[PDB]
Nucleic acid binder design. Structure first.
Ligand SMILES: [Mg+2]
Ligand SMILES: [Mg+2]
Ligand SMILES: [Mg+2]
Ligand SMILES: [Mg+2]
Ligand SMILES: [Mg+2]
Ligand SMILES: [Mg+2]
Ligand SMILES: [Mg+2]
Ligand SMILES: [Mg+2]
Ligand SMILES: [Mg+2]
Ligand SMILES: [Mg+2]
Ligand SMILES: [Mg+2]
Ligand SMILES: [Mg+2]
Ligand SMILES: [Mg+2]
Ligand SMILES: [Mg+2]
Ligand SMILES: [Mg+2]
Ligand SMILES: [Mg+2]
Ligand SMILES: [Mg+2]
Ligand SMILES: [Mg+2]
Ligand SMILES: [Mg+2]
Ligand SMILES: [Mg+2]
Ligand SMILES: [Mg+2]
Ligand SMILES: [Mg+2]
Ligand SMILES: [Mg+2]
Ligand SMILES: [Mg+2]
Ligand SMILES: [Mg+2]
Ligand SMILES: [Mg+2]
Ligand SMILES: [Mg+2]
Ligand SMILES: [Mg+2]
Ligand SMILES: [Mg+2]
Ligand SMILES: [Mg+2]
Ligand SMILES: [Mg+2]
Ligand SMILES: [Mg+2]
Ligand SMILES: [Mg+2]
Ligand SMILES: [Mg+2]
Ligand SMILES: [Mg+2]
Ligand SMILES: [Mg+2]
Ligand SMILES: [Mg+2]
Ligand SMILES: [Mg+2]
Ligand SMILES: [Mg+2]
Ligand SMILES: [Mg+2]
Ligand SMILES: [Mg+2]
Ligand SMILES: [Mg+2]
Ligand SMILES: [Mg+2]
Ligand SMILES: [Mg+2]
Ligand SMILES: [Mg+2]
Ligand SMILES: [Mg+2]
Ligand SMILES: [Mg+2]
Ligand SMILES: [Mg+2]
Ligand SMILES: [Mg+2]
Ligand SMILES: [Mg+2]
Ligand SMILES: [Mg+2]
Ligand SMILES: [Mg+2]
Ligand SMILES: [Mg+2]
Ligand SMILES: [Mg+2]
Ligand SMILES: [Mg+2]
Ligand SMILES: [Mg+2]
Ligand SMILES: [Mg+2]
Ligand SMILES: [Mg+2]
Ligand SMILES: [Mg+2]
Ligand SMILES: [Mg+2]
Ligand SMILES: [Mg+2]
Ligand SMILES: [Mg+2]
Ligand SMILES: [Mg+2]
Ligand SMILES: [Mg+2]
Ligand SMILES: [Mg+2]
Ligand SMILES: [Mg+2]
Ligand SMILES: [Mg+2]
Ligand SMILES: [Mg+2]
Ligand SMILES: [Mg+2]
Ligand SMILES: [Mg+2]
Ligand SMILES: [Mg+2]
Ligand SMILES: [Mg+2]
Ligand SMILES: [Mg+2]
Ligand SMILES: [Mg+2]
Ligand SMILES: [Mg+2]
Ligand SMILES: [Mg+2]
Ligand SMILES: [Mg+2]
Ligand SMILES: [Mg+2]
Ligand SMILES: [Mg+2]
Ligand SMILES: [Mg+2]
Ligand SMILES: [Mg+2]
Ligand SMILES: [Mg+2]
Ligand SMILES: [Mg+2]
Ligand SMILES: [Mg+2]
Ligand SMILES: [Mg+2]
Ligand SMILES: [Mg+2]
Ligand SMILES: [Mg+2]
Ligand SMILES: [Mg+2]
Ligand SMILES: [Mg+2]
Ligand SMILES: [Mg+2]
Ligand SMILES: [Mg+2]
Ligand SMILES: [Mg+2]
Ligand SMILES: [Mg+2]
Ligand SMILES: [Mg+2]
Ligand SMILES: [Mg+2]
Ligand SMILES: [Mg+2]
Ligand SMILES: [Mg+2]
Ligand SMILES: [Mg+2]
Ligand SMILES: [Mg+2]
Ligand SMILES: [Mg+2]
Ligand SMILES: [Mg+2]
Ligand SMILES: [Mg+2]
Ligand SMILES: [Mg+2]
Ligand SMILES: [Mg+2]
Ligand SMILES: [Mg+2]
Ligand SMILES: [Mg+2]
Ligand SMILES: [Mg+2]
Ligand SMILES: [Mg+2]
Ligand SMILES: [Mg+2]
Ligand SMILES: [Mg+2]
Ligand SMILES: [Mg+2]
Ligand SMILES: [Mg+2]
Ligand SMILES: [Mg+2]
Ligand SMILES: [Mg+2]
Ligand SMILES: [Mg+2]
Ligand SMILES: [Mg+2]
Ligand SMILES: [Mg+2]
Ligand SMILES: [Mg+2]
Ligand SMILES: [Mg+2]
Ligand SMILES: [Mg+2]
Ligand SMILES: [Mg+2]
Ligand SMILES: [Mg+2]
Ligand SMILES: [Mg+2]
Ligand SMILES: [Mg+2]
Ligand SMILES: [Mg+2]
Ligand SMILES: [Mg+2]
Ligand SMILES: [Mg+2]
Ligand SMILES: [Mg+2]
Ligand SMILES: [Mg+2]
Ligand SMILES: [Mg+2]
Ligand SMILES: [Mg+2]
Ligand SMILES: [Mg+2]
Ligand SMILES: [Mg+2]
Ligand SMILES: [Mg+2]
Ligand SMILES: [Mg+2]
Ligand SMILES: [Mg+2]
Ligand SMILES: [Mg+2]
Ligand SMILES: [Mg+2]
Ligand SMILES: [Mg+2]
Ligand SMILES: [Mg+2]
Ligand SMILES: [Mg+2]
Ligand SMILES: [Mg+2]
Ligand SMILES: [Mg+2]
Ligand SMILES: [Mg+2]
Ligand SMILES: [Mg+2]
Ligand SMILES: [Mg+2]
Ligand SMILES: [Mg+2]
Ligand SMILES: [Mg+2]
Ligand SMILES: [Mg+2]
Ligand SMILES: [Mg+2]
Ligand SMILES: [Mg+2]
Ligand SMILES: [Mg+2]
Ligand SMILES: [Mg+2]
Ligand SMILES: [Mg+2]
Ligand SMILES: [Mg+2]
Ligand SMILES: [Mg+2]
Ligand SMILES: [Mg+2]
Ligand SMILES: [Mg+2]
Ligand SMILES: [Zn+2]
Lengths: 208, 83, 124, 99, 138
RNA sequence: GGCUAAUCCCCCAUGUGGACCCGCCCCUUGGGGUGUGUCCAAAGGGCUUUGCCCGCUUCCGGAUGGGCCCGCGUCCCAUCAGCUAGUUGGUGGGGUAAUGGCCCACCAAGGCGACGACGGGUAGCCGGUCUGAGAGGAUGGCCGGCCACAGGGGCACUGAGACACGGGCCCCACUCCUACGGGAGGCAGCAGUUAGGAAUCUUCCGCAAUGGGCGCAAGCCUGACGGAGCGACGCCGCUUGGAGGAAGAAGCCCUUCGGGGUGUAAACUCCUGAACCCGGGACGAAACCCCCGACGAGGGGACUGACGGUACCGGGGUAAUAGCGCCGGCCAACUCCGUGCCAGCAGCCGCGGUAAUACGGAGGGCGCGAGCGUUACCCGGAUUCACUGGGCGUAAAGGGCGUGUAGGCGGCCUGGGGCGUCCCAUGUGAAAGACCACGGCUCAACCGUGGGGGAGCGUGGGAUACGCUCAGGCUAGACG
RNA sequence: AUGCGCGCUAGGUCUCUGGGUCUCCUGGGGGCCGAAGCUAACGCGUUAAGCGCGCCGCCUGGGGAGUACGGCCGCAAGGC
């Protein structure tokens, strides 16, 4: 009901790896090795030259499933970033990437984006000291995001954290791995992040 | 007659008031002559009241009548305070 | 036309006729059936299409299609009317919604059910 | 500002009262042209001093009859009867047009 | 008579240039002279001189066009690609200063008649005044 | 029929002053003086009783609330073209807070209309809203403003105010009581009933807050209002788990019978821990009030919470609802079988008469997701009423031809005016809303504070090119 | 199946009526073929269907229908 169903499957449809899986989306299982076709009876069948519509729909779906939120919440986003002063594409990206759940992932307190959401929504995180259990929450920059201490020694936490001892973090972010604090310093520009998405095709999808 | 009072601006449960000069027969919530301040009972801000006395005082001089809870706020900003 | 023409005369704003008196303006209207019957369609088709002449709460008597695989109605079956027209028979201007009032649902449709009025069966 | 207009007296026929014709122009709010309209104002002349054809300034005044809310201020132009015989020709125009 | 004079000056220019005439006469007026002056200075006509044809005053525009172009249709690029009237009689067109039109993304102009006198859009703007929008040129 | 009190009602007085007739003075529609004449005031009550409070009286100002009046904007039909006797103006009078045919007498003979009178139809108007690139189109529920009504129709009374929804009178319909004489109502206040309908809620709690009436005050009244309830009606937030897990079980689908699919999906492993349980537990509420001081300013003190044991906080804790539309083009999504112009689909083309991606089921897929579809309606696409932004040789469309009325339009020069036009200043453009910024409820929705902008109209000032206008002049148009 | 008016945009050829130092020039009508340009094509093209301005008439899918009803006109037929 949000997405919540098979996934290394829509890795497949969207036609490239997304890492909604974390560990093992880096396996030689991501099912993207073993299976670069789409789901269905027809996955192994020969391509059809897609529709201008098709392509744009697809790009949108991709961006969506990466960030892993509802159409509604996503569109309300785009519309929001559309309205704001600045370049509608990169702002979409700024805003999306400014979601608490996704900050958690990007700070590596969770392995996958969906884990990071459950992490939040179960109370494990705090933004500047008050536990904040909505995943939509907007991280403004200058905000510090920690595992709050009650959870600080629980299993999965120490797992990730003590496994991320040594890693670099995204350059709009900082990490004190001991304290499991992190700061969201600044906003990402397009290639501040990675993404396998021509954002401009999404802008176009909505201009329909 | 002309009255200085509260008019209700919050939401359900999140109750903000405008301090207001009005002819007493208006809806409390309806159109009024001057806004003279705000009052926030739940004290949610640094400033949950503001007045600008010099204005309130003018209306007082013309027989603007503060309700009690009005006048407490007025004198709280010491619109009233003598010297 | 010139501008003094437009100033003099103006442009004619242009209205539209409703494809229905389901009247009021209402989005459905109930009614009872007078005849429930079977009709043939026009040039390119044959079948036996199933329809009811229905007297309505809006006073008007109309013909309504009775969609879907099979059905239950008869002379005094009272039913609700929807609107939507059936290309290729004549003057069927409204559809019967199935599953409201005396109009049953369409038995065994597993597939497009919200339309056709049928209850989700038990996946077992 | 009691409004004050100006126009032509086309009406002689009244006891202590005159009809002034006041034209206005203005841009038309859609087709953009400027167009030119007018009305007949019923006006107060206590001494019968303004006479046919005069062109007078007209004033917002405290009320006089059903219809006179206007007293005459001053004369501006005297005797231009083109105006008078233009509107007057237009009223003789009327009663073409019917049954 | 000529119902709109000013127009017929611009339309004379129009027909001239699209047959590539090196020059053309328009019966002389002063405000017409004005518009011409602005076209000149702004780079659109080569310039104009004031003349006599059968003891009547004309203003001979001389005009320009770019170079001879290769391939078939050597005809040369127009300098005045487009020029058009706006206010006409019995449709009169006036702008505020805030309503003064920016043209062809700036590559064009607009010649409006203020009571500061006759101006290009951009002139009217630095002058900060409105008026009768006469034409656009570009 | 009788008695009686008052802040009830008269009578005489006092005249600050005010009313009115007449006269002058300023001023200019009935504004302010001013003089003679005439006319007009009051109400008591409480005490911490000889001086304080609450009241009364005439006058002038303020302040708020309104009446009236004027410019301008304000739907369709001309197959509605004429309309008008209180009509239209004058005098005098009547009425009112006040102008005015608002009314009335006499006099005059007007007033209105293709710049659309008169009739017919439809409708409450706005701030706004929806859609739109705008321009436009549509709209006016909810919140705010204004108006109008209170079963239908008349009518006054009493008041500062009404021609008064829970006030009075009469006619009418309807209901109920009736000793048949006569009486009694009026939810378009909250709730609720019933009828109608596709369809719209509890006969709830509270008087704690804010607001209103009367009261010196305590207080009383308050279905205004603050809250709960019910409906996915709307928006926003949120869950139905997170990591691991096969060369990938069974079942089911397809199959060239090799295999392909559902699919890391499942099973299983570990972790988290909606729900639910326990414990603490609000904010909104500090005034009126009492005390000191002067009933002041200022200080000190007491009470009070419907919502609520709710929100929130701490502890414990279970792997915990998925659905609906769709898969012939428009349009993202294909296969097998059934069926055989039938059953049926359908928004348009179109599909179905034995190989059906179009009907029905399956497996698969695509789209959204506590929703998803349908119907109705509005804008849109529709530059398909064309201002932006369309046309008329043959596609719809040049009047059969002329003549001219209205009306639209208007060559070259010079000058005055400055109406159009343009600029400045200022006033107005209430509050909500829209936009921007911060801020508050863990976010948002919702909310606050601030800021910006704004068309239009008022007033002052300014420019004069163009359009007007008056003036004078020319001759390229026109005419003789 | 092409409202009127005015102004601008190559030519060539035949013609009707004027004027001219009469090969030819210059007016004003009628024809044909063409520059640019237009047009859905066909075609138009200084006798515009081209470039512009003024003003009038008119159009808004096919049918029903130039019908019905109303009004007005006419003796009528019938017209608007
Ligand atoms: Mg699915
Ligand atoms: Mg591993
Ligand atoms: Mg943007
Ligand atoms: Mg990383
Ligand atoms: Mg950075
Ligand atoms: Mg990545
Ligand atoms: Mg790329
Ligand atoms: Mg869009
Ligand atoms: Mg303070
Ligand atoms: Mg067929
Ligand atoms: Mg039955
Ligand atoms: Mg339909
Ligand atoms: Mg179907
Ligand atoms: Mg007279
Ligand atoms: Mg009078
Ligand atoms: Mg006067
Ligand atoms: Mg007449
Ligand atoms: Mg006629
Ligand atoms: Mg303006
Ligand atoms: Mg007695
Ligand atoms: Mg008394
Ligand atoms: Mg006295
Ligand atoms: Mg008087
Ligand atoms: Mg006086
Ligand atoms: Mg006296
Ligand atoms: Mg006395
Ligand atoms: Mg007494
Ligand atoms: Mg008392
Ligand atoms: Mg009031
Ligand atoms: Mg006032
Ligand atoms: Mg007023
Ligand atoms: Mg009379
Ligand atoms: Mg009188
Ligand atoms: Mg009265
Ligand atoms: Mg009366
Ligand atoms: Mg008399
Ligand atoms: Mg008029
Ligand atoms: Mg009606
Ligand atoms: Mg309406
Ligand atoms: Mg109505
Ligand atoms: Mg809008
Ligand atoms: Mg918009
Ligand atoms: Mg449109
Ligand atoms: Mg608009
Ligand atoms: Mg409206
Ligand atoms: Mg309502
Ligand atoms: Mg309202
Ligand atoms: Mg009534
Ligand atoms: Mg009733
Ligand atoms: Mg009745
Ligand atoms: Mg009544
Ligand atoms: Mg009273
Ligand atoms: Mg009333
Ligand atoms: Mg009642
Ligand atoms: Mg009665
Ligand atoms: Mg009886
Ligand atoms: Mg009664
Ligand atoms: Mg009752
Ligand atoms: Mg009710
Ligand atoms: Mg019923
Ligand atoms: Mg309710
Ligand atoms: Mg409610
Ligand atoms: Mg109660
Ligand atoms: Mg209370
Ligand atoms: Mg109170
Ligand atoms: Mg009140
Ligand atoms: Mg009181
Ligand atoms: Mg006491
Ligand atoms: Mg008591
Ligand atoms: Mg009571
Ligand atoms: Mg309520
Ligand atoms: Mg329901
Ligand atoms: Mg593990
Ligand atoms: Mg496999
Ligand atoms: Mg298997
Ligand atoms: Mg098998
Ligand atoms: Mg197998
Ligand atoms: Mg899993
Ligand atoms: Mg295992
Ligand atoms: Mg546990
Ligand atoms: Mg306890
Ligand atoms: Mg409290
Ligand atoms: Mg407290
Ligand atoms: Mg109390
Ligand atoms: Mg004490
Ligand atoms: Mg004392
Ligand atoms: Mg005391
Ligand atoms: Mg105190
Ligand atoms: Mg205190
Ligand atoms: Mg309790
Ligand atoms: Mg509890
Ligand atoms: Mg807990
Ligand atoms: Mg725990
Ligand atoms: Mg499970
Ligand atoms: Mg599990
Ligand atoms: Mg689509
Ligand atoms: Mg497709
Ligand atoms: Mg069969
Ligand atoms: Mg066979
Ligand atoms: Mg078969
Ligand atoms: Mg088959
Ligand atoms: Mg076949
Ligand atoms: Mg199929
Ligand atoms: Mg289909
Ligand atoms: Mg199918
Ligand atoms: Mg399925
Ligand atoms: Mg939701
Ligand atoms: Mg439409
Ligand atoms: Mg669109
Ligand atoms: Mg459009
Ligand atoms: Mg249309
Ligand atoms: Mg078209
Ligand atoms: Mg147009
Ligand atoms: Mg068209
Ligand atoms: Mg034409
Ligand atoms: Mg035709
Ligand atoms: Mg003709
Ligand atoms: Mg003529
Ligand atoms: Mg004329
Ligand atoms: Mg002239
Ligand atoms: Mg003129
Ligand atoms: Mg001129
Ligand atoms: Mg001048
Ligand atoms: Mg001026
Ligand atoms: Mg001057
Ligand atoms: Mg105002
Ligand atoms: Mg302004
Ligand atoms: Mg505002
Ligand atoms: Mg804006
Ligand atoms: Mg915040
Ligand atoms: Mg808001
Ligand atoms: Mg503002
Ligand atoms: Mg402002
Ligand atoms: Mg604006
Ligand atoms: Mg502004
Ligand atoms: Mg505006
Ligand atoms: Mg001025
Ligand atoms: Mg001057
Ligand atoms: Mg002259
Ligand atoms: Mg001469
Ligand atoms: Mg014809
Ligand atoms: Mg030549
Ligand atoms: Mg000859
Ligand atoms: Mg010729
Ligand atoms: Mg030709
Ligand atoms: Mg050619
Ligand atoms: Mg020529
Ligand atoms: Mg020739
Ligand atoms: Mg011809
Ligand atoms: Mg021509
Ligand atoms: Mg054509
Ligand atoms: Mg059309
Ligand atoms: Mg038709
Ligand atoms: Mg005929
Ligand atoms: Mg008729
Ligand atoms: Mg007839
Ligand atoms: Mg007859
Ligand atoms: Mg005939
Ligand atoms: Zn994967």
């Amino acid at each position: 009901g949000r997405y919540i169903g098979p996934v290394c499957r829509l890795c497949r449809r969207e036609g490239v790896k997304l890492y909604l899986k974390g560990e093992r989306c880096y396996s030689p299982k991501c099912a993207m090795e073993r299976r670069p076709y789409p789901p269905g009876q027809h996955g192994q069948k020969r391509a059809r030259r897609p529709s201008d519509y098709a392509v744009r729909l697809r790009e949108k779906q991709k961006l969506r499933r990466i960030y892993g939120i509802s159409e509604r919440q996503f569109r309300n986003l785009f519309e929001e970033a559309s309205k704001k002063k600045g370049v509608t594409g990169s702002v979409f990206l700024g805003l999306l990437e400014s979601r608490l759940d996704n900050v958690v992932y990007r700070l590596g307190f969770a392995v996958s984006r969906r884990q990071a959401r459950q992490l939040v929504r179960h109370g494990h995180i705090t933004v500047n000291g008050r536990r904040v259990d909505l995943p939509s929450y907007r991280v403004r920059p200058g905000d510090e995001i920690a595992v709050a201490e009650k959870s600080r020694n629980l299993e999965l936490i120490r797992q990730n954290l003590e496994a991320m001892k040594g890693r670099k973090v995204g350059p709009w972010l900082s990490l004190d791995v001991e304290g499991m604090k992190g700061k969201f310093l600044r906003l990402p520009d397009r290639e501040d992040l990675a993404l396998p998405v021509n954002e401009q095709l999404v802008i176009e999808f909505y201009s329909r | 007659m002309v009255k200085i009072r509260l008019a209700r601006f919050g939401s359900k449960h999140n109750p903000h008031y405008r301090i207001v000069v009005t002819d007493a027969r208006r809806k409390r919530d309806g159109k009024y002559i001057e806004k003279i301040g705000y009052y926030d009972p739940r004290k949610t801000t640094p400033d949950w009241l503001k007045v600008d006395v010099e204005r309130a005082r003018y209306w007082l001089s013309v027989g603007a009548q503060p309700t009690d809870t009005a006048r407490r706020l007025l004198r709280q900003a010491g619109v009233f305070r003598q010297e | 036309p010139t501008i003094n023409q437009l100033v003099r005369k103006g442009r004619e704003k242009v209205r539209k006729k409703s494809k229905v008196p389901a009247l009021k303006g209402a989005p459905f209207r109930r009614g009872v059936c007078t005849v429930v019957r079977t009709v043939t369609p026009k040039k390119p088709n044959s079948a036996l299409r199933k329809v009811a002449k229905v007297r309505l709460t809006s006073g008007y008597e109309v013909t309504a299609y009775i969609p879907g695989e099979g059905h239950n109605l008869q002379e005094h079956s009272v039913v609700l009317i929807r609107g939507g027209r059936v290309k290729d028979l004549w003057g069927v201007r409204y559809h019967i919604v199935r599953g409201v009032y005396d109009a049953a649902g369409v038995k065994d449709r597993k597939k497009s059910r919200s339309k056709y009025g049928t209850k989700k069966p038990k996946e077992a | 500002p009691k409004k004050v207009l100006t126009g032509v007296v086309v009406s002689d026929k009244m006891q202590k009262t005159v009809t002034v014709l006041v034209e206005r122009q203005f841009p038309h709010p859609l087709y953009g042209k400027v167009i030119k309209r007018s009305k007949k104002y019923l006006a107060h002349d206590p001494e019968e001093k303004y006479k046919l054809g005069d062109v007078v300034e007209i004033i917002e005044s405290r009320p006089i009859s059903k219809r006179k809310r206007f007293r005459v201020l001053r004369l501006v132009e005297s005797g231009r009867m083109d105006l008078v015989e233009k509107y007057l020709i237009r009223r003789q125009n009327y009663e073409s047009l019917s049954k | 008579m000529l119902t709109d004079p000013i127009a017929d000056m611009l339309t004379r220019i129009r027909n001239a240039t699209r047959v590539y005439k090196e020059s053309t006469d328009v019966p002389a007026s002063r405000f017409k002279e004005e518009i011409l002056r602005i076209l000149a200075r702004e780079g659109f006509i080569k310039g104009y001189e004031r003349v006599d044809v059968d003891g009547k005053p004309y203003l001979r525009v001389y005009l320009k066009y770019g170079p001879r172009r290769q391939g078939p249709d050597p005809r040369p690029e127009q300098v005045i690609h487009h020029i058009r009237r706006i206010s006409k009689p019995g449709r009169r067109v006036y702008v505020g200063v805030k309503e003064i039109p920016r043209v062809r993304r700036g590559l064009g102009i607009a010649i409006l008649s203020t009571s500061k006198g006759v101006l290009t859009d951009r002139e009217a703007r630095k002058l900060g005044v409105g008026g009768e929008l006469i034409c656009e040129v570009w």
